[PDB]
Design a protein around this nucleic acid. Structure first.
Ligand SMILES: Nc1nc2c(ncn2[C@H]2C[C@H](O)[C@@H](COP(=O)(O)OP(=O)(O)OP(=O)(O)O)O2)c(=O)[nH]1
Ligand SMILES: [Ca+2]
Ligand SMILES: [Ca+2]
Ligand SMILES: [Ca+2]
Length: 341
DNA sequence: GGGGGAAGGATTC
DNA sequence: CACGGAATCCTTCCCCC
C-alpha cells in the first residue's frame, strides 16, 4: 500500500500572507481575541519567523507580545481559510478518488494504484507540491510511507515545506528507534501512562501483557499501538463525514447567572444553525468550560429533528441542569448539534 | 451473558 | 495568562432478550 500525506504549512498564518503578500518575511500571529480585555485571547498559530522565538498555537497573546512586541497580530478568519482549504482539496481529488480529509489542512491521498515504488511516488509528490504552490500560492509538506500513521510521521519529520519518503526498510528501524510520544495519537497524557509502564518505544509494546495494557490506555489504543509494532497496521482511507456542528463562545466575565449567560448561549445557537446549512439535527448538547478550565456538558437526543425554537428552549434547560449539577463559575458556553436526520 | 442506545467525560489534533 | 471545532473512545446506566 502507498499512502501519501499532505499538510499545509502554518496554514492560517500562511493564508494571511497569501491574502496580503507584504507580510512575507515578517513574524505573523493569527489570534483569537476573547474581548475580556486589551489583547486577551490566544494564539491560533504563527508562521515560522515567530515560531523560532517560542510563539505558537495555544499560548496567550499577552504572553506573545512580551516576546515579539512588533510582530503582526491578525484576528482569525475561519470562513476564508475554509474556502482556501476546499479549493486545495479539490485539486487533490484530481490525483485520486481514495482521499480522506482528516482536518482543515490534513489530507491523505491513496495512490497504491497509480504508482509502483516510492521513487515513482516521490515525483508524484513534487507534482502536487509544485502545483498547489502554483495554483494557490500555498506551501505544503508531503509525507510518504507504507500506511497512514507513517505517511503522517514522514510529514512531521520534513516540515516546514518539504517531502520525506519512509519506506518499508526504514519503517522497521523506527518501530525500534522512534520515541513513542511522537506517534500520532499519543498526547502528553497517553505519553505519560506509557512511561509508567516502561513503553518508551513502539517495539516495547510487545514486552507487556496486553491485559495490563488494556487497563491503562483502553482497548482501542492498545490494539492500535500493537498493530503498529507488529507492522501489521493498515487502516483504509475512507471519506469521513461531518457528524456534529457547534460553537462555543467566551464570556466577558466568568458567571453563574442564568440571564447573564443566556445571550451568549443564543448567539452560539444562531451561528450553529447558520452553519447547519439545511441539515436537521436530532441531538443537542450544551457544553461549558468551568472557571478551572474543566469541560462539563449536558445534552439530549430527540426522536425527531430539532427546530430552532426547540433548540432555544431546550438549551436553556440543559444549561440549568449544569448550573444545578455543578457549582463552579462558567467561563465559556456553547452548543453542539449531532445525529443529523 | 449480551445487544444497543444514551449520556457524561477523556484525549487528540 | 489559554481560543476554538470536531472525532474517537471509555465508562456507566438502562431496558430487556
Ligand atoms: N484556534 C486554534 N486553532 C488551532 C490550534 N492549533 C492548531 N490550530 C489550527 C490552525 C492551524 O493552521 C491548523 C492546521 O495546522 P496545525 O493544526 O498543524 O498548525 P500549523 O499550520 O502550524 O501546523 P504545522 O506545525 O506547521 O505542521 O490547525 C489551536 O490551538 N487553536
Ligand atoms: Ca499544518
Ligand atoms: Ca497538521
Ligand atoms: Ca505526540
Amino acid at each position: 500500500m502507498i499512502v501519501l500525506f499532505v499538510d499545509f504549512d502554518y496554514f492560517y498564518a500562511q493564508v494571511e500572507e497569501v491574502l496580503n503578500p507584504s507580510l512575507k518575511g515578517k513574524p505573523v500571529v493569527v489570534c483569537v481575541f476573547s474581548g475580556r480585555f486589551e489583547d486577551s485571547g490566544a494564539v491560533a498559530t504563527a508562521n515560522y519567523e515567530a515560531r523560532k522565538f517560542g510563539v505558537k498555537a495555544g499560548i496567550p497573546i499577552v504572553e506573545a507580545k512580551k516576546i515579539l512586541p512588533n510582530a503582526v497580530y491578525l484576528p482569525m478568519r475561519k470562513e476564508v481559510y475554509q474556502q482556501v482549504s476546499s479549493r486545495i482539496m479539490n485539486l487533490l481529488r484530481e490525483y485520486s478518488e481514495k482521499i480522506e480529509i482528516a482536518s482543515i489542512d490534513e489530507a491523505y491521498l491513496d495512490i497504491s494504484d497509480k504508482v509502483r515504488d516510492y521513487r515513482e511516488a516521490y515525483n508524484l509528490g513534487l507534482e502536487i507540491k509544485n502545483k498547489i504552490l502554483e495554483k494557490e500560492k500555498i506551501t505544503v509538506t508531503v509525507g510518504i510511507s507504507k500506511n497512514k500513521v507513517f505517511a503522517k510521521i514522514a510529514a512531521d519529520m520534513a516540515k516546514p515545506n518539504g517531502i520525506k519518503v519512509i519506506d518499508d526498510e526504514e519503517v522497521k528501524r523506527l518501530i525500534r528507534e522512534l520515541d513513542i510520544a511522537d506517534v500520532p495519537g499519543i498526547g502528553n497524557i497517553t505519553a505519560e501512562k506509557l512511561k509508567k509502564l516502561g513503553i518508551n518505544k513502539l517495539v516495547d509494546t510487545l514486552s507487556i501483557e496486553f491485559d495490563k495494557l488494556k487497563g491503562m490506555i483502553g482497548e482501542a489504543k492498545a490494539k492500535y499501538l500493537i498493530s503498529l509494532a507488529r507492522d501489521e497496521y493498515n487502516e483504509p482511507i475512507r471519506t469521513r463525514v461531518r457528524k456534529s456542528i457547534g460553537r462555543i463562545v467566551t464570556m466577558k466575565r466568568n458567571s453563574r447567572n442564568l440571564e447573564e449567560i443566556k445571550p451568549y448561549l443564543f448567539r452560539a445557537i444562531e451561528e450553529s444553525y447558520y452553519k447547519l446549512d439545511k441539515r436537521i439535527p436530532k441531538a443537542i448538547h450544551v457544553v461549558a468550560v468551568t472557571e478551572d478550565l474543566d469541560i462539563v456538558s449536558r445534552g439530549r437526543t430527540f426522536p425527531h429533528g430539532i427546530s430552532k425554537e426547540t433548540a432555544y428552549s431546550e438549551s436553556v434547560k440543559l444549561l440549568q441542569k449544569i448550573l444545578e449539577e455543578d457549582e463552579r463559575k462558567i467561563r465559556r458556553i456553547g452548543v453542539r448539534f449531532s445525529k443529523f436526520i
